Amino acid sequence: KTQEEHLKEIMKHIVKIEVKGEEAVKKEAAEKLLEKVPSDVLEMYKAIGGKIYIVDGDITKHISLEALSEDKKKIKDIYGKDALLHEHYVYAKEGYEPVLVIQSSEDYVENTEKALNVYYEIGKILSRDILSKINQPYQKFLDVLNTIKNASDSDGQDLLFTNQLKEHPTDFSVEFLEQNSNEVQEVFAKAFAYYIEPQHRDVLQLYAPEAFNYMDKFNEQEINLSLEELKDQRMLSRYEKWEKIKQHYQHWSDSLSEEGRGLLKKLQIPIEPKKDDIIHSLSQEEKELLKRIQIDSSDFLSTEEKEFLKKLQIDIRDSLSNPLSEKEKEFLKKLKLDIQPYDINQRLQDTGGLIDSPSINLDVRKQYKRDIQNIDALLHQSIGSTLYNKIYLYENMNINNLTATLGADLVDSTDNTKINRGIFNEFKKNFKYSISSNYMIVDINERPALDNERLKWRIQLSPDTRAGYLENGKLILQRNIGLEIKDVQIIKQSEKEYIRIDAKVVPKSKIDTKIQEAQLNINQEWNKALGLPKYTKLITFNVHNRYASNIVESAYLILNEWKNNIQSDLIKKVTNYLVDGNGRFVFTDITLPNIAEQYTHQDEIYEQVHSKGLYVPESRSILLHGPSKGVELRNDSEGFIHEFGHAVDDYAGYLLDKNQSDLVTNSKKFIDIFKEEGSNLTSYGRTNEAEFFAEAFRLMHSTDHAERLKVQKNAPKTFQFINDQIKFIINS
Ligand SMILES: Cc1cc(N)c2cc(NC(=O)Nc3ccc4nc(C)cc(N)c4c3)ccc2n1
Numbered sequence: 166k167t168q169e170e171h172l173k174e175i176m177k178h179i180v181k182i183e184v185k186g187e188e189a190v191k192k193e194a195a196e197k198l199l200e201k202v203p204s205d206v207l208e209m210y211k212a213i214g215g216k217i218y219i220v221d222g223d224i225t226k227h228i229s230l231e232a233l234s235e236d237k238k239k240i241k242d243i244y245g246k247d248a249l250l251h252e253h254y255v256y257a258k259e260g261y262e263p264v265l266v267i268q269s270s271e272d273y274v275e276n277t278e279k280a281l282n283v284y285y286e287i288g289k290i291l292s293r294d295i296l297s298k299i300n301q302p303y304q305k306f307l308d309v310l311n312t313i314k315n316a317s318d319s320d321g322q323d324l325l326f327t328n329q330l331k332e333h334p335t336d337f338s339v340e341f342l343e344q345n346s347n348e349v350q351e352v353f354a355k356a357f358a359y360y361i362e363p364q365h366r367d368v369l370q371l372y373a374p375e376a377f378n379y380m381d382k383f384n385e386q387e388i389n390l391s392l393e394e395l396k397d398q399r400m401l402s403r404y405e406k407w408e409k410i411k412q413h414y415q416h417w418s419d420s421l422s423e424e425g426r427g428l429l430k431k432l433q434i435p436i437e438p439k440k441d442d443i444i445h446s447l448s449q450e451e452k453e454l455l456k457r458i459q460i461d462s463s464d465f466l467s468t469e470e471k472e473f474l475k476k477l478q479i480d481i482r483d484s485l486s487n488p489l490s491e492k493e494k495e496f497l498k499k500l501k502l503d504i505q506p507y508d509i510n511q512r513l514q515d516t517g518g519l520i521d522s523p524s525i526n527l528d529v530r531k532q533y534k535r536d537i538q539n540i541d542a543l544l545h546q547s548i549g550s551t552l553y554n555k556i557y558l559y560e561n562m563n564i565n566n567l568t569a570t571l572g573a574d575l576v577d578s579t580d581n582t583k584i585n586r587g588i589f590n591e592f593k594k595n596f597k598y599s600i601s602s603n604y605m606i607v608d609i610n611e612r613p614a615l616d617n618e619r620l621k622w623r624i625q626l627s628p629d630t631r632a633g634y635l636e637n638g639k640l641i642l643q644r645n646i647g648l649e650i651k652d653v654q655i656i657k658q659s660e661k662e663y664i665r666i667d668a669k670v671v672p673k674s675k676i677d678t679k680i681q682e683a684q685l686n687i688n689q690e691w692n693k694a695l696g697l698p699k700y701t702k703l704i705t706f707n708v709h710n711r712y713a714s715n716i717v718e719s720a721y722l723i724l725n726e727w728k729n730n731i732q733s734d735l736i737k738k739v740t741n742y743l744v745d746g747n748g749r750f751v752f753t754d755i756t757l758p759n760i761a762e763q764y765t766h767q768d769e770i771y772e773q774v775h776s777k778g779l780y781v782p783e784s785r786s787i788l789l790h791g792p793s794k795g796v797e798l799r800n801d802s803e804g805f806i807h808e809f810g811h812a813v814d815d816y817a818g819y820l821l822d823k824n825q826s827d828l829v830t831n832s833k834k835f836i837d838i839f840k841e842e843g844s845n846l847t848s849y850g851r852t853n854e855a856e857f858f859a860e861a862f863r864l865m866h867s868t869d870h871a872e873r874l875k876v877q878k879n880a881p882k883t884f885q886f887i888n889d890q891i892k893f894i895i896n897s
Pocket residue numbers: 464465466774775776777778779780781782808811855
């Protein structure tokens with residue numbers, strides 16, 4: 166009930182009573198009126214220097230409204246009827262010194278139509294004087310407006326829209342909202358008004374449900390987030406927040422050692438491969454091979470990597486066609502591991518925390534384990550303090566980090582300042598929870614992003630959350646945090662559009678539990694659809710990163726496209742085969758060479774593979790990495806099915822002579838079909854027979870029927886070959 170006090174405190178400031186001789190009846194009447202307004206919009210008004218004056222008679226007769234031009238003397242009531250300031254009871258003055266003027270009365274309780282107007286004036290203060298300073302209302306509110314105009318019942322419009330909007334043909338776009346700022350603000354206010362005045366609220370909910378709902382959720386929840394964003398722009402607020410935190414960690418800081426500071430700094434800027442050293446620990450024979458390798462000839466060395474290697478040879482020459490060699494690609498594979506940057510946070514993201522993964526040389530594995538085990542000990546003090554309650558921290562992120570495939574079309578191709586609503590809704594779809602397996606580095610007060618960062622997180626730390634303080638106003642958080650996504654919306658900031666993500670920190674065990682129960686649910690369901698034994702572990706969720714929930718909700722959808730595009734009898738025979746060898750359908754966000762289904766079956770470490778998908782015969786499992794973008798694959802489904810092709814290529818070649826488990830794609834008959842039709846499909850498909858078979862099997866089962874035709878009229882002998890194997894497997 167600190168409630169009533171919050172309002173008393175705030176009101177004694179902004180509220181000025183200046184009447185004749187009833188300064189207790191009138192001074193108590195105002196308290197009754199403003200009490201209906203959300204405590205938070207009053208503080209936001211105080212924030213921008215606004216004040217409320219309760220006066221008698223003609224309100225024009227006040228010092229604050231003298232500078233009023235002989236035009237702004239005529240206002241419109243909530244119903245759109247022209248009036249005159251010297252004949253009205255309220256007025257909110259714009260400008261850098263906001264003013265609210267209210268006449269005196271107590272019949273505000275009785276004569277509701279005036280309270281309605283007074284609130285409408287406040288709503289105006291809210292949408293025009295306050296929210297405008299943080300670029301609101303925006304897309305979310307525009308969506309309410311578009312729901313109303315394009316709904317069947319035109320009553321919602323007849324109650325909130327001025328004819329200007331009523332007669333507008335198309336929907337209200339961001340562009341419209343910019344040219345008609347005054348108009349939208351008006352609608353906002355009216356809706357705020359009806360919602361706030363206890364008697365008209367029913368009307369609102371009766372003829373404009375979406376507006377009621379928006380204003381309902383906004384005044385009870387979302388508004389304090391507005392105050393939050395509003396305070397974030399105040400220099401002194403920003404400085405005040407930073408100081409309380411700097412104080413809370415003052416002891417922890419003064420105690421840090423050169424060694425501790427060395428660790429935190431190394432954790433902010435990775436150490437690049439020092440060319441020189443590479444050359445040394447190389448080899449007399451190897452140097453010779455390196456002395457000439459058209460790095461470009463290979464295909465597993467990114468553009469960034471190839472360049473580095475190029476400069477490696479060109480730096481050892483200072484003294485005295487393109488066939489793809491074997492032991493040469495072996496040499497280039499080894500070096501790939503060797504020329505990666507020392508990046509602790511990157512190591513955590515790739516392994517999802519599983520720092521013992523055989524994915525890199527043992528020497529480097531231990532250095533990572535040592536440094537991490539140490540950072541974990543440094544970041545022991547939690548954010549919780551007596552100096553502050555709820556606390557928000559910020560992080561600017563690149564969407565490619567969550568979903569490179571959607572990241573491809575997030576920014577509008579025409580106007581780089583706009584975000585594609587199409588991809589936005591998709592991205593937002595199943596984004597319910599997130600996980601952090603590395604050390605998040607956030608800002609105390611929000612800061613401008615880098616061009617490729619169109620994601621602006623606003624995170625509500627738990628008092629329990631441990632962290633470390635940095636001098637530049639940032640905090641390094643402890644690994645293994647849990648995050649519940651609370652809201653995802655398009656916002657405009659500094660002349661550009663971003664995706665604001667409102668998230669709350671929770672115990673990681675809470676999120677893991679959801680995933681685990683998902684795995685149980687998804688397997689129950691699919692074990693029934695495939696007729697597998699009740700409790701078999703078929704599908705598995707290896708989720709550890711920031712897009713966490715999507716990896717899970719996505720698997721369901723991928724498997725649906727997988728059953729509606731392939732013959733049920735083929736699936737069953739093939740997956741029974743897989744299950745027989747302990748196979749697994751692994752959906753993950755950690756890089757593939759860290760899923761055991763692949764590494765516990767590797768000869769050498771450098772023989773690892775990372776990509777959108779992968780099939781491992783030795784384990785009979787299919788691996789699908791979520792975050793990436795399959796080069797020739799348009800989406801996750803496709804990718805999965807492509808890998809199921811390799812699985813079929815397996816069971817088929819197995820049914821030829823189980824006395825030899827081999828690939829039916831290795832058959833002499835097929836090596837010829839590839840010799841001829843091997844270049845009529847996808848580029849990727851041309852890589853080799855196993856892949857060509859897989860890309861072909863894929864198109865044949867695409868959702869795009871047109872795509873099925875392409876194989877049948879460009880790969881005849883193949884369309885038939887793949888169909889023989891199907892019927893083969895199906896019957897045998
Ligand atoms: C730079 C680069 C290098 C690779 N080797 C890639 C491989 C893939 N995918 C696969 O290798 N898939 C896959 C899938 C199934 C496979 N099955 C068998 C029996 C043997 C395989 N080598 C096999 C391979 C995707 C992207 C790649 N990108």
